[PDB]
Design a protein around this motif. Structure first.
Motif, PDB file in Angstrom:
ATOM      1  N   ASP A 180      25.789 -37.569  14.032  1.00 30.60           N
ATOM      2  CA  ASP A 180      25.778 -37.423  15.477  1.00 30.60           C
ATOM      3  C   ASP A 180      24.345 -37.502  16.005  1.00 30.60           C
ATOM      4  OD1 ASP A 180      28.597 -37.014  15.697  1.00 30.60           O
ATOM      5  OD2 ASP A 180      28.335 -34.887  15.279  1.00 30.60           O
ATOM      6  N   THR A 189      30.921 -32.746  17.530  1.00 26.70           N
ATOM      7  CA  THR A 189      32.304 -32.445  17.780  1.00 26.70           C
ATOM      8  C   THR A 189      32.525 -31.001  18.271  1.00 26.70           C
ATOM      9  OG1 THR A 189      32.699 -34.070  16.139  1.00 26.70           O
ATOM     10  CG2 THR A 189      34.592 -32.695  16.802  1.00 26.70           C
ATOM     11  N   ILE A 235      30.260 -28.537  16.160  1.00 21.21           N
ATOM     12  CA  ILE A 235      29.625 -28.946  14.917  1.00 21.21           C
ATOM     13  C   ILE A 235      28.759 -30.111  15.231  1.00 21.21           C
ATOM     14  CG2 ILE A 235      29.844 -29.939  12.624  1.00 21.21           C
ATOM     15  CD1 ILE A 235      32.859 -28.790  12.813  1.00 21.21           C
ATOM     16  N   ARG A 281      24.126 -30.138   8.443  1.00 21.73           N
ATOM     17  CA  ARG A 281      24.845 -30.094   9.711  1.00 21.73           C
ATOM     18  C   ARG A 281      24.430 -28.804  10.409  1.00 21.73           C
ATOM     19  NH1 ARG A 281      27.953 -29.458   5.482  1.00 21.73           N
ATOM     20  NH2 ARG A 281      28.217 -31.719   5.749  1.00 21.73           N
ATOM     21  N   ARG A 298      30.717 -45.602   7.942  1.00 22.55           N
ATOM     22  CA  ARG A 298      30.350 -44.198   7.971  1.00 22.55           C
ATOM     23  C   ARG A 298      29.176 -44.086   7.011  1.00 22.55           C
ATOM     24  NH1 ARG A 298      29.490 -41.193  10.127  1.00 22.55           N
ATOM     25  NH2 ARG A 298      28.583 -39.194   9.467  1.00 22.55           N
ATOM     26  N   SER A 347      26.459 -32.776  13.385  1.00 24.53           N
ATOM     27  CA  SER A 347      26.044 -33.252  12.090  1.00 24.53           C
ATOM     28  C   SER A 347      24.986 -34.345  12.189  1.00 24.53           C
ATOM     29  CB  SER A 347      27.248 -33.638  11.260  1.00 24.53           C
ATOM     30  OG  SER A 347      27.434 -35.018  11.302  1.00 24.53           O
ATOM     31  N   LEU A 371      38.672 -29.216  15.882  1.00 23.30           N
ATOM     32  CA  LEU A 371      37.963 -28.924  14.630  1.00 23.30           C
ATOM     33  C   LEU A 371      38.926 -28.640  13.480  1.00 23.30           C
ATOM     34  CD1 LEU A 371      34.961 -26.656  15.825  1.00 23.30           C
ATOM     35  CD2 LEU A 371      35.126 -29.106  15.929  1.00 23.30           C
ATOM     36  N   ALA A 372      38.553 -29.097  12.283  1.00 19.83           N
ATOM     37  CA  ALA A 372      39.205 -28.686  11.051  1.00 19.83           C
ATOM     38  C   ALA A 372      38.498 -27.404  10.575  1.00 19.83           C
ATOM     39  CB  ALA A 372      39.124 -29.786   9.985  1.00 19.83           C
ATOM     40  N   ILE A 399      35.396 -35.750   6.381  1.00 15.42           N
ATOM     41  CA  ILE A 399      34.274 -34.962   6.771  1.00 15.42           C
ATOM     42  C   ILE A 399      33.778 -34.330   5.472  1.00 15.42           C
ATOM     43  CG2 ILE A 399      34.826 -34.500   9.210  1.00 15.42           C
ATOM     44  CD1 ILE A 399      36.347 -31.953   8.219  1.00 15.42           C
ATOM     45  N   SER A 400      32.569 -33.797   5.488  1.00 17.45           N
ATOM     46  CA  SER A 400      32.023 -33.234   4.260  1.00 17.45           C
ATOM     47  C   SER A 400      32.176 -31.729   4.143  1.00 17.45           C
ATOM     48  CB  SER A 400      30.573 -33.657   4.056  1.00 17.45           C
ATOM     49  OG  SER A 400      29.949 -33.878   5.278  1.00 17.45           O
ATOM     50  N   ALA A 401      32.575 -31.078   5.237  1.00 14.84           N
ATOM     51  CA  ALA A 401      32.620 -29.628   5.293  1.00 14.84           C
ATOM     52  C   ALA A 401      33.540 -29.061   6.353  1.00 14.84           C
ATOM     53  CB  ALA A 401      31.209 -29.038   5.454  1.00 14.84           C
ATOM     54  N   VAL A 402      34.073 -27.883   6.063  1.00 13.12           N
ATOM     55  CA  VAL A 402      34.993 -27.217   6.960  1.00 13.12           C
ATOM     56  C   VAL A 402      34.422 -25.822   7.113  1.00 13.12           C
ATOM     57  CG1 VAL A 402      37.338 -26.444   7.318  1.00 13.12           C
ATOM     58  CG2 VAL A 402      36.941 -28.498   5.928  1.00 13.12           C
ATOM     59  N   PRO A 403      34.209 -25.402   8.363  1.00 14.76           N
ATOM     60  CA  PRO A 403      33.725 -24.063   8.587  1.00 14.76           C
ATOM     61  C   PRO A 403      34.821 -23.074   8.260  1.00 14.76           C
ATOM     62  CG  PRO A 403      34.264 -25.098  10.640  1.00 14.76           C
ATOM     63  CD  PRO A 403      34.361 -26.152   9.615  1.00 14.76           C
ATOM     64  N   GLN A 442      20.988 -40.240   5.581  1.00 14.51           N
ATOM     65  CA  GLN A 442      20.684 -39.967   6.983  1.00 14.51           C
ATOM     66  C   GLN A 442      19.768 -38.773   7.120  1.00 14.51           C
ATOM     67  OE1 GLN A 442      25.369 -38.787   8.070  1.00 14.51           O
ATOM     68  NE2 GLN A 442      24.386 -40.640   8.868  1.00 14.51           N
ATOM     69  N   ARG A 464      27.166 -42.598   5.477  1.00 13.77           N
ATOM     70  CA  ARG A 464      26.244 -41.469   5.311  1.00 13.77           C
ATOM     71  C   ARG A 464      24.995 -41.857   4.547  1.00 13.77           C
ATOM     72  NH1 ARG A 464      30.897 -38.300   4.404  1.00 13.77           N
ATOM     73  NH2 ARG A 464      31.517 -37.260   6.364  1.00 13.77           N
ATOM     74  N   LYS A 506      40.161 -36.044   7.919  1.00 14.10           N
ATOM     75  CA  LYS A 506      39.139 -36.253   8.962  1.00 14.10           C
ATOM     76  C   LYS A 506      37.924 -36.975   8.381  1.00 14.10           C
ATOM     77  CE  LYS A 506      40.217 -33.443  12.802  1.00 14.10           C
ATOM     78  NZ  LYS A 506      39.689 -33.866  14.153  1.00 14.10           N
TER      79      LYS A 506
END
Ligand SMILES: Nc1ncnc2c1ncn2[C@@H]1O[C@H](COP(=O)(O)O)[C@@H](O)[C@H]1O
Ligand SMILES: Nc1ncnc2c1ncn2[C@@H]1O[C@H](COP(=O)(O)O)[C@@H](O)[C@H]1O
Lengths: 333, 93, 128, 128, 93, 324
Positions: free
Chosen positions: F307, F190, F302, F289, F138, F304, F194-195, F215-219, F162, F140, F213
């Motif tokens: 992706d 994605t 989402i 993202r 991963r 990012s 979703l989270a 991931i770096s962020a959750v909406p 990235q 990043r 997950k």
């Protein structure tokens, strides 16, 4: 009777009062006592101190369950000065942060600035015992400890300051009103060899004065000697709080810009003032010392709380006893 | 009392909960809830001065977060007729 | 950074598993403790009242054997949230016969120490 | 008036600072040039110390490799000084090209181990 | 001419202060007066970006007080045709 | 030649440009690199990251003179999360502060939240090889590392992001203009499972989404699924620097109140937008993202940077770009 003799009668009465009370009688009914593990780091110590708006704490040795001496601004000041005068690199001073309190004290013992050992009095012993102990140790504060026989543990009840004792007296002795002899006919206070500083004096130079004369404040004067301000040992702590030792490089003027608001002010009086007004000032403001000045605020002397208290407890025809034993020491800002 | 032992009770360890019923501990009394160290800044500029304490609560441990990596632990006890709330700051281990 | 004191130590989750973590802390700390007793093979809330006994290390290490008597109580603050209330009930050496069967209090003086020092040792255990 | 600065700060008397730099190099384990008096008297080049250090991570693996570090005292203002510390690079003494000259010479890229040796100097200095 | 030694020059010990102050050190030249890490040129994108350094300061140590009990040390070096100022944060001891 | 076949052709050019360049080509001519000793306390690390305005740092092992891994918010997120699940005592978490970076990596290792070897490329390998390697884990971020034959010291030249890579592409490939295929006929990003969280969600609960997950962020959404905000793993950093771990207990709404005025913002786009416009957004501002929404700001998906990067490097149609 004459003014001189009235004072002497008044002083006999305050002595009797001081002797009759216990250190425990000074205490408030419900109170707080903050204790530090001797094994704390210094930098942690400065934060807690600053955070709690205190300038002192008794130390606790928890393997032993014994009192481990009293932490005051004098510790930092002496250690800061010791490292400062023997290092050629300013930033090295920041290492003091990484000492434990136990270590800091070891440094003071190896440079002969803290006595053999621990000093205290029983809380249920005469308040005059506390005054004499403080007098002989040149301390400004004294811990009230009682040893528990069941456990051997020593129970720190509180720490007693000369400010609080003097304030206690001013509130319980109407006889303070009969102290009308003026200072200039008295021999009390310091009138020569005054450690003073200017706005342009660097803080590390004040620190050295602080340690060398073992004092807690340094008046700030201009040439020609007028009183401008005061630089306290506590103001030093605040500067070096949160690890910023380069603040010691600041001039006094620059450092005062960083000092919080102090109401109350800086207390001054004249050579012709007397103990009675000083007591009324003690009851309604935190006097740590009075600076003696003239017509034009020219500094002539310093009268601090120790000077007042030592004078009071020393008796007939003013002893002279008084102050005796190891008269420099760590104790106790 | 008099029972002081080892080790952990057999149930609780091995194993086969769900419970027996296992009850819920008592609810929290209101005379806890408030700690006298909590009065911020503290009054007349003594500052060491506190309100008289609730007697039932002499020698109960009290605790707070320091943000500095040390324990903050207190307890009020009685001396003669006066009350000492000692708050200790201690390293871990 | 000067915030709120609160009695006891904050804990959360499942009361039995909490009680199970408290018992283990005590044994790692070397303390001795009561255990619960069933009213048939059934239990009562009193389950959450331990009361322990601690050899006092600075006494042991000296010429004595003195114990500290510390009583623990689990309150529920809100479902999922608990207080572990810790209370001193004194200290007792070796047949110092005046007196108290309720743990001789530490003689007449009733010091917060070594209690709080042992409280410290408890919290580390409960945190490690 | 800005947090980063070249070198390491010092104050006092320059000869005393020089004696301090030397003690420090000595106790960190380095070797160094020494001042040489020119017809009875010492000169300002005494404040230029060429030093040499056996690189520890290299030594741990049976390698004989040196870092060349040049130290230089400058006066910023009266009583205030900069100890300037400079990298002359590195040399595994058993290779190049097959023994023709020396003293760093060739590589000039990486700031490590230089920075790690600087950290050793500064430790020694700060604990005289 | 004999390069390296391990002895502290003897004269620098004991009697010292005779104002024959063994030469003064040179004055600080203007180019050592400013470090390119001090000019946190922030842009709004690339925050790693720095002004091109001065060639004669390549591989010179630079330092900063941290207020955190760690050393902050840096040096600028050439990688191929570009420049890397690495700032290291390191424990003492 | 038709939007589809045109994108097909632009990608081919972009791909050719990425091999052709080294990672080194991405770097500015003068740049800072901040490095952390692996034996630093967690406490000092968070402070240092905070005051240098950074969210990660390479680690240096200074006995060996070796790169020792990359510190990122994932490290704290994983261990906090571990700690929250397994302790009955809340204030125990604060002991994390006294971990050294080494033992923090050690914890993450036991519980297996961390790969074994320290992922890297040579600064002069192809940019494509760094993209592949980032994609392979991963990461990043990937460290550009060289070694010094004279000493065996590893030289950390830099650490490549990235974002920087996508901006480099943006600044140098006009062909980014020719990617007019709508996101809705691609399979990138994605778009389900979703989270999300709401304002009432406890922060500790977001923290476990981030770790689970990874991931770096959750909406942040409301009951209707409308996008209100975001909660990033770097917000958590701010919560806990200066060492106040009781903040984790705060809900998202109250935690939001502590966000510094300094906040980049939240980027949105629509399912009918495409890569040309997104590259254009990337070129001119910091995009972490994009949250894909409709006209009533209802969250749909989402997208990012990984992706985008992954589509870019792997064929037009090799991966999640397969598509319609
Ligand atoms: N700035 C000073 N210079 C000379 N002596 C002082 C000074 N400040 C205080 N003293 C004397 O030193 C003793 C204790 O000082 P203090 O730190 O104010 O309690 C008292 O007898 C003072 O009168
Ligand atoms: N909140 C989220 N829920 C589900 N998947 C996500 C979320 N955020 C990112 N992802 C996916 O996980 C990968 C890495 O996310 P990021 O942390 O933004 O680089 C990308 O493929 C994202 O689409």
């Amino acid at each position: 009777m004459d003014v001189q003799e009235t004072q002497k009668g008044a002083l006999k009465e305050i002595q009797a009062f001081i002797r009759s009370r216990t250190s425990y009688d000074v205490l408030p009914t419900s109170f707080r006592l903050i204790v530090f593990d001797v094994t704390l780091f210094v930098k942690t110590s400065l934060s807690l101190l600053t955070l709690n708006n205190i300038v002192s704490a008794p130390l606790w040795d928890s393997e032993a369950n014994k009192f481990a001496g009293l932490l005051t601004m004098a510790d930092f000041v002496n250690v800061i000065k010791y490292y400062y005068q023997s290092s050629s690199f300013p930033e090295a001073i920041a290492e003091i942060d990484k000492f434990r309190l136990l270590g800091l004290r070891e440094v003071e013992r190896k440079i002969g600035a803290i006595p053999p050992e621990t000093i205290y009095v029983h809380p249920m012993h005469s308040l005059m015992d506390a005054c004499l102990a403080m007098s002989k140790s040149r301390a400004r504060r004294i811990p009230l400890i009682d040893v528990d026989g069941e456990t051997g543990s020593e129970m720190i009840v509180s720490v007693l300051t000369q400010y609080r004792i003097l304030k206690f007296i001013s509130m319980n002795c109407k006889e303070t009103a009969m102290l009308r002899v003026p200072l200039n006919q008295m021999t009390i206070g310091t009138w020569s060899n005054l450690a003073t500083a200017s706005m342009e004096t660097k803080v590390y130079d004040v620190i050295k004065m602080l340690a060398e004369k073992n004092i807690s404040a340094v008046p700030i004067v201009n040439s020609e000697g007028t009183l401008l301000n005061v630089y306290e040992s506590v103001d030093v702590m605040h500067l070096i709080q949160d690890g910023d030792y380069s603040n010691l490089d600041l001039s006094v003027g620059e450092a005062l810009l960083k000092r919080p608001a102090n109401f109350d002010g800086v207390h001054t009086c004249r050579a012709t003032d007397r103990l009675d007004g000083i007591f009324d000032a003690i009851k309604h403001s935190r006097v740590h010392r009075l600076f003696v000045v003239d017509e034009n605020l020219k500094l002539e002397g310093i009268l601090s709380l120790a000077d007042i208290l030592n004078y009071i407890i020393y008796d007939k025809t003013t002893t002279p006893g008084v102050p005796e034993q190891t008269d420099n020491f760590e104790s106790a800002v | 009392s008099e029972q002081y032992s080892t080790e952990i009770p057999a149930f609780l360890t091995s194993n086969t909960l769900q419970e027996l019923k296992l009850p819920k501990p008592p609810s929290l009394p209101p005379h806890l809830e408030k700690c006298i160290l909590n009065s911020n800044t503290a009054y007349k500029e003594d500052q060491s001065v506190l309100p008289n304490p609730n007697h039932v609560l002499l020698n109960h441990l009290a605790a707070a977060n320091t943000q500095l990596g040390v324990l903050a632990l207190s307890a009020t006890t009685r001396y003669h007729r006066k009350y000492v709330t000692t708050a200790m700051f201690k390293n871990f281990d | 950074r000067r915030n709120k004191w609160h009695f006891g130590v904050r804990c959360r989750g499942d009361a039995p598993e909490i009680l199970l973590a408290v018992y283990r802390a005590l044994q790692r700390a070397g303390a001795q403790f009561t255990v619960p007793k069933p009213v048939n093979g059934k239990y009562r809330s009193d389950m959450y009242t331990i009361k322990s006994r601690w050899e006092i290390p600075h006494c042991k290490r000296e010429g004595k054997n003195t114990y500290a008597y510390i009583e623990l109580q689990l309150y529920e603050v809100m479902p999922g949230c608990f207080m572990l209330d810790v209370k001193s009930n004194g200290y007792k050496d070796i047949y110092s016969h005046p007196e108290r069967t309720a743990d001789h209090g530490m003689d007449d003086l009733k010091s917060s120490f070594p209690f709080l020092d042992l409280c410290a040792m408890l919290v580390c255990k409960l945190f490690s």
